[PDB]
Amino acid sequence: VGRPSGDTQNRDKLILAARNLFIERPYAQVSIREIASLAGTDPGLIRYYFGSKEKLFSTMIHETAMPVLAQLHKARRETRQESPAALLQTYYSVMSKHPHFPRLMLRIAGLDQSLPENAEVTKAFYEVVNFENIAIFQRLKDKNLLKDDVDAHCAQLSFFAMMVFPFIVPENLLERVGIELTPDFLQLLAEQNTRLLQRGLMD
Amino acid sequence: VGRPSGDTQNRDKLILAARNLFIERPYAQVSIREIASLAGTDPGLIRYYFGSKEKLFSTMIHETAMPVLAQLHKARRETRQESPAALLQTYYSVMSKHPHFPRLMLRIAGLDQSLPENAEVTKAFYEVVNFENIAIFQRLKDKNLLKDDVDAHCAQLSFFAMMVFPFIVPENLLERVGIELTPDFLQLLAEQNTRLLQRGLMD
């Protein structure tokens, strides 16, 4: 779009390269030299634009997340006071368009958060996921809306699993059980899991 | 156990090193030199004992799996004709003792199976998981044991998720929603998901 300067292109090349050496490839100490070689830029531009490799990665996480979170927020404006079903339906609708986002988030979440090399990326991660309704079944239990013997932690965990796991499972394994995660299948799956959750946990 | 020769110890050091550069660390082309340096052996012993790096990795996968599959088979001898609940209860019982096994399997399953470097490890993977009851809800649908509007693919996917996802989610995230996967919690969770599946999908 438009006629970007070499300078802004270079900046965006670095952020793209960071995103790819995360979605597609290497682990911890990918060097500055390697990111810059993938981007096709002077390695000095990482420190110039971002100060550090860690800030390049956190900046990539925010930029990657911004439109995803905007879409989910827009999708959820329409929906009802905490309804597990609505959260799951809108999650599927948005992650249908951003199929790699859940696996990226889960990968970041698995970093060793005790290591100082990971503090900046971890701070970014928790900011990005701060929208999550991590006690929704606790609230439902307290409003007496769950079956009497339902445990909120267990309900929450199984909800989290049905929502997120489809996007984390390798395509190799979905194919093996006859599934492709098309928009149509995710629409069926939203409908099916809505009913599993209602009949399973609510009354 | 016993007094192993340096020769068998060295062999087992290589298999251990392979297992760790898989559970803990690097991606694709970890070299022979690097595996042997981690093991503390001559790099020539990889080709000597195993022929190739790929056969070292497949051999590690089988050896890692053998006692896990034996335990699950033993646990399931006691159980009833296809019962999703029994599969999930025994899975939790065995993966409680082998908490890293599901994440290892899922990691292997995500390799690019079109690449020739991955054919051997992929063959091993599919052998290890050949026990999985990947059409159990299809069979249940056909025996008329599911609710009328239940889709077998969707049921199977949500079952797979509740069974496996707990072991794949980073501990950072379980802790954030107040969960540690203790034997006691997995026992509660088995009980809870048994009821979610019955009330959710069966009649």
Automatic annotation (TrEMBL), chains A, B:
<keyword id="KW-0238">DNA-binding</keyword>
<dbReference type="InterPro" id="IPR009057">
    <property type="entry name" value="Homeodomain-like_sf"/>
</dbReference>
<dbReference type="InterPro" id="IPR050624">
    <property type="entry name" value="HTH-type_Tx_Regulator"/>
</dbReference>
<dbReference type="GO" id="GO:0003677">
    <property type="term" value="F:DNA binding"/>
</dbReference>
<protein>
    <submittedName>
        <fullName>Transcriptional regulator, TetR family</fullName>
    </submittedName>
</protein>
<dbReference type="InterPro" id="IPR001647">
    <property type="entry name" value="HTH_TetR"/>
</dbReference>
<feature type="DNA-binding region" description="H-T-H motif">
    <location>
        <begin position="31"/>
        <end position="50"/>
    </location>
</feature>
<dbReference type="Pfam" id="PF00440">
    <property type="entry name" value="TetR_N"/>
</dbReference>
<feature type="domain" description="HTH tetR-type">
    <location>
        <begin position="8"/>
        <end position="68"/>
    </location>
</feature>
